[PDB]
Scaffold this active site. Sequence first.
Site, PDB file in Angstrom:
ATOM      1  N   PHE A   1      32.867  52.756  72.660  1.00 15.48           N
ATOM      2  CA  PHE A   1      34.046  53.451  73.392  1.00 15.48           C
ATOM      3  C   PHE A   1      35.045  54.001  72.008  1.00 15.48           C
ATOM      4  O   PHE A   1      35.951  54.253  72.295  1.00 15.48           O
ATOM      5  CB  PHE A   1      34.787  52.802  74.116  1.00 15.48           C
TER       6      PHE A   1
ATOM      7  N   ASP B   1      39.366  36.898  79.062  1.00 15.47           N
ATOM      8  CA  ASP B   1      38.603  37.223  77.970  1.00 15.47           C
ATOM      9  C   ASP B   1      38.801  36.393  76.706  1.00 15.47           C
ATOM     10  O   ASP B   1      38.850  36.483  75.768  1.00 15.47           O
ATOM     11  CB  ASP B   1      38.569  38.794  77.362  1.00 15.47           C
TER      12      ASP B   1
END
Length: 273
Positions: free
Chosen positions: A28, A136
């Site tokens: 990305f 995360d």
Amino acid sequence: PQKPWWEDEWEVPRETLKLVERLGAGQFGEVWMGYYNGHTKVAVKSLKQGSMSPDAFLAEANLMKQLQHQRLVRLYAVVTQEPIYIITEYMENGSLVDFLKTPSGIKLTINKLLDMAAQIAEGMAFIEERNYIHRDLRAANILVSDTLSCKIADFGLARLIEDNEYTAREGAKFPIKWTAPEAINYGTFTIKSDVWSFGILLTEIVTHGRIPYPGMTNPEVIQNLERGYRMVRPDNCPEELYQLMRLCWKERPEDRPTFDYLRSVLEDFFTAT
Ligand SMILES: COc1ccc(N(C(=O)Oc2c(C)cccc2C)c2ccnc(Nc3cc(OC)c(OCCCN4CCN(C)CC4)c(OC)c3)n2)c(OC)c1
């Protein structure tokens, strides 16, 4: 919505930035070490066009505009006219998981590891108090400064919680070894899910970055957890700490402690050693 770019205090002309060294390259985009107005060292994340939606890309920047603290990597600026960039505070010693493997990291004493652990819990306590969740939380996303202090980074999955919990997608997949059972099973996350991850992170700290659940595949990790087992005592891990890890891994999310509590305990452990 956000203020228009011509009004957003966070928007800066792309001319103010100069990318110098690439830190990471992904599907990305890329992340670089750069300079803002020549003298200020920063980190710059660039969107690989086509890879993902700009809306999707900037969402974490917008959250960071809302979530600010000394213990969390600070949003520095944003460039919202393509190509798009997210600029942040720069951490000289990289990720904790990597730093702990360097000659400097290898020499860290247990006392310093506890200090760092408390620093991390301090930041999560703030996230906890502001009604957010990270999702995360792992050594990979803890960055280290030149003064050996730690900060929480990567708010990509981070979310402002409206009433205790957030439900992920049925197709959304997460790291098995770092994610709480309830999250892997029902996609439901709460600050308590992060507490579980913190427990795993602790094993990362004391083992200088080793992969949790040594010699176990994910199916094995899941199966063992369901039996009531938890990760084996890491080599050279203070028993007090191992027991703190266990609190983070209790069966019922509600039975796990708060991050403020974890902070206090770690701070006591640190002051002792
Ligand atoms: C995936 O790489 C990442 C790259 C950058 C960032 N990142 C950040 O905030 O990225 C970001 C932004 C800017 C905006 C939104 C969301 C996110 C995640 C960030 C922010 C501030 N400082 C640093 N310092 C850093 C210095 C360093 O070095 C000075 C280093 O080491 C790079 C080299 C390490 N490699 C290790 C293996 N091998 C030895 C080759 C080198 C680092 O590596 C971790 C980090 N990184 C990551 O943060 C999670 C992960």
